[PDB]
Design a protein around this nucleic acid. Structure first.
Ligand SMILES: [Cl-]
Ligand SMILES: [Cl-]
Ligand SMILES: [Cl-]
Ligand SMILES: [Cl-]
Ligand SMILES: [Mn+2]
Ligand SMILES: [Mn+2]
Ligand SMILES: [Mn+2]
Ligand SMILES: [Mn+2]
Ligand SMILES: [Mn+2]
Ligand SMILES: [Mn+2]
Ligand SMILES: [Mn+2]
Ligand SMILES: [Mn+2]
Lengths: 92, 85, 105, 98, 96, 78, 108, 93
DNA sequence: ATCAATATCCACCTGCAGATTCTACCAAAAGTGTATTTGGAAACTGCTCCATCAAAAGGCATGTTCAGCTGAATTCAGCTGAACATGCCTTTTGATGGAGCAGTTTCCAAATACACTTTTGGTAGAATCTGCAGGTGGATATTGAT
DNA sequence: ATCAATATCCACCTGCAGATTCTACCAAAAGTGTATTTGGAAACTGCTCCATCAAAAGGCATGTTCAGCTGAATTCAGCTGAACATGCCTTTTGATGGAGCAGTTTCCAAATACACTTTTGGTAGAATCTGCAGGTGGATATTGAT
């Protein structure tokens, strides 16, 4: 049993291009991309919590890590989407 | 009391200072347009480093940029600095 | 029973992201909002890349995104190209680019 | 005839001098002002440890010296002894800074 | 008999290979080279085929990027012909 | 003698994809030298990973990790 | 109880095995740490320190100086192929550069 | 307030290697930075190694592999010698 | 430049193999409900450093003059590298067969974690020790005019 | 070839800022005993790899011909280095006052822990239908007379 992000990438693809598919190799590219960004953000959040002597990684460390790892405008949009998701989840 | 507003300080990076930097880099002859170009390059570099350092400062809920904020920002760009831990 | 992804309005898996944070030797504890936030960011980036790559595939009269379309989408976007500056895309070519001085007369 | 060195002799003396030593080459107070101005444009009323400004200056000068090394190699590659903006631009392009 | 002028076919080849994505080194020679080099680090090794394919993708991408930088170095010197000193300058600036 | 399997036409195609129009005759051997160094470094680290896992089969992931250690992240082989 | 003996002395080391163990434990590297891992790591850190100090002290003696300064560390690192490779992206504050003048710039 | 550093161990090794040589405070700061940098490089690669192979424990084997991955050719062999020696001595003591 | 001849590339097509998408089963992972603990925020202080200014001497920035040597522009021959025809050898493609390695499960000794207690090495700050900066003066090597 | 001018190299010296040693407290490492996790050996399986053989096309090696690029030689206007007067702004050390960083205590929102249920994501085979040969026709670009 090997896990991947394939079904989630495909769901987002159907949201964005309902009549478009994806080849197996491109899906592999996407899995590499998701794992890469996960490790970048999570590692920076780990370093942030450790620098400040905190035991817990919170959405604040994730947000700061996003501001550090992502270029300018992409960072703003990602922060908007993260805070949005967190507030939606909290109200639900 | 408060500092008078800081303006136009990239010009503090003077032509003689740029020349000395180039000398340490082994440069013998310098075209007249190098100085403005060097100022632009330096300003971009310093902006990027300071932006990341200040991000570290603000995450720590501090108002004082520390040497370690700068060190983390420099490591952040793949430029490990020794001597300020 | 409702999944945390659906509570957050997300397609990417909040539960899996939370577990991977717990198991990645990142910190002793993970807060409830962190996997939601991280999954949302990952979904947003995936959506941007798939939007642009699907546009490239439609322009090429193809149903399926292939690595070449992902390469086009990444390298033609300044911030994505910066983000993935040191990344190699297998079977992604290069952008067509011929230095002007090499063109004839 | 008052004594004059030929163009290039003093420049080579300066290369030897500054490659022998390690002191910072930008004036300290102007660099301080530059750092504080730039930081003020990101967040107001910031304070700095003095060692933080010194770390920034050491990093900036090391960066610029290395860049000038690469720029010099680019100028010599083109059969010149004079560094020009396009040498800096080629060095930064190859380095991945663009 | 028809002959294209020097440079015309080279530009056609540039356009062709920048349009496509297939690997440009023959597979068997690369496989042989990989196994020879690996034997000098640890003996009696096996390779997944995908491992050799990953090595080839990485090698060809590296070489293509290096040739881009080499080309910029040659053009910087007001030439259109890449030479060993261009590769050497590109690798020096890169930190290799 | 396997580095000579990297033929002049293959190196030329690689240069073409890199936008090169004209190639000096000494490039090919130089390219071979460069390629050898590159492969050596990557393969060394990959085999170390293989040797740490007590395996005798180099996997795609060994190569991916070796490429990452060298700052050249490769997508597509996870 | 038995007489207290430090792990550093048991290992024949100058660098502190206990401190390295604690730093491994608290650095979120793994759930568990083996008994030999901090010994090995402390030994490697001590050895690398010994190499850099050997070369920096030699450079300091060549300059007829008793005390190592950052310039000597920079000399030691940049004149040694493997140390310079290891610390390739490292800036040494107050280290300067090696004397190097491209031949084409010398007078003719 | 208690600030820890590697200074006393650096100084012991310095006296071991150059009995009549000292070190300035700034050079000692570079040395402390060096030790922490190498610590993080080795420990991070060891963490990743254990994770790739699904091991809960970082052992001297992960440290050794990390050292081989970090260090240029000959320094790696030397460091491995000193680490292995230290571990065997520690185990017999 | 126009005009003919010639070569290559791109868009289209059909047939169909193969890759992708769809479907259904199930072990494992996520979710739930409840109980319990705890990290870290909030509030409160106490010092540590930072911001800003002040004085004064001198080191250094700036602008200017003038001339040497460099970059820029140009020309051109020879030698290199491109283009192309020819023939052959390696690589590719396909088929078969095993050995060998990657995984899997389990059970017990061995290894590592953790609470509590004892001991001591490491640190902060004080007291002491000192090398090297920062001066002088003289020897020597380099530079440039003549 | 000299000879002046100027820089650089060495050797000397001492006082004090900076480095080292000394001192005593205490936070952290070591010792002890107990609890919990794990690594690995012993078999066992079933995919992947490797070895081997065979034919054929397709890419490569080779030789020939020549276009055109690179490197050499030349020239010159003007840019940039060297030197200097002038004057200011940096540097160094200290004062003032408070902002903010850091230590401490208290307690709650939020996290972990655990038993059990619900849901999901992976997988293999079937069903679907895209993309690729391998052909055409037309667009586009190149090349040679003129
Ligand atoms: Cl959170
Ligand atoms: Cl320019
Ligand atoms: Cl060359
Ligand atoms: Cl161990
Ligand atoms: Mn401003
Ligand atoms: Mn608490
Ligand atoms: Mn010239
Ligand atoms: Mn004691
Ligand atoms: Mn002196
Ligand atoms: Mn206050
Ligand atoms: Mn499902
Ligand atoms: Mn076709």
């Amino acid at each position: 049993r090997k896990e991947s992000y394939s079904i989630y990438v495909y769901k987002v693809l159907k949201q964005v291009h309902p009549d478009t598919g994806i080849s197996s190799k491109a899906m592999g590219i996407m899995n590499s991309f998701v794992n890469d960004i996960f490790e970048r953000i999570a590692g920076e959040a780990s370093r942030l919590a450790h620098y400040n002597k905190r035991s817990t990684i919170t959405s604040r460390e994730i947000q700061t890590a996003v501001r550090l790892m992502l270029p300018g405008e992409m960072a703003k949009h990602a922060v908007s989407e993260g805070t949005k998701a967190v507030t939606k989840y909290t109200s639900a | 009391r408060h500092r008078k507003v800081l303006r136009d300080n990239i010009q503090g990076i003077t032509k003689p200072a740029i020349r000395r930097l180039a000398r340490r880099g082994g440069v013998k002859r310098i075209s007249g347009l190098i100085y403005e170009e060097t100022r632009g390059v330096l300003k971009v570099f310093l902006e990027n480093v300071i932006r990341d350092a200040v991000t570290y400062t603000e995450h720590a809920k501090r108002k004082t940029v520390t040497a370690m904020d700068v060190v983390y920002a420099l490591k952040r760009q793949g430029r490990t600095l020794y001597g300020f831990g | 029973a409702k999944t945390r992804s659906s509570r957050a309005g997300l397609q990417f898996p909040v539960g899996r992201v939370h577990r991977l944070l717990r198991k990645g030797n990142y910190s002793e504890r993970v807060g409830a909002g962190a996997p939601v936030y991280l999954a949302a960011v990952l979904e947003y980036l995936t959506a941007e890349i798939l939007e642009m790559a699907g546009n490239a595939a439609r322009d090429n009269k193809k149903t399926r995104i292939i690595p070449r379309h992902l390469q086009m989408a990444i390298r033609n976007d300044e911030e994505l190209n910066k983000l993935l500056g040191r990344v190699t895309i297998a079977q992604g070519g290069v952008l067509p680019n011929i230095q002007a001085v090499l063109l004839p007369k | 005839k008052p004594h004059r060195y030929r163009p290039g002799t003093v420049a080579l003396r300066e290369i030897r001098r500054y490659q022998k030593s390690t002191e910072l080459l930008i004036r300290k107070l102007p660099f301080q002002r530059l750092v504080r101005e730039i930081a003020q444009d990101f967040k107001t009323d910031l304070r700095f440890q003095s060692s933080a400004v010194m770390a920034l200056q050491e990093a900036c000068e090391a960066y610029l010296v290395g860049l000038f090394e690469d720029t010099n190699l680019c100028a010599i590659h083109a059969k010149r002894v004079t560094i020009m903006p396009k040498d800096i631009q080629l060095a930064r392009r190859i380095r991945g800074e663009r």
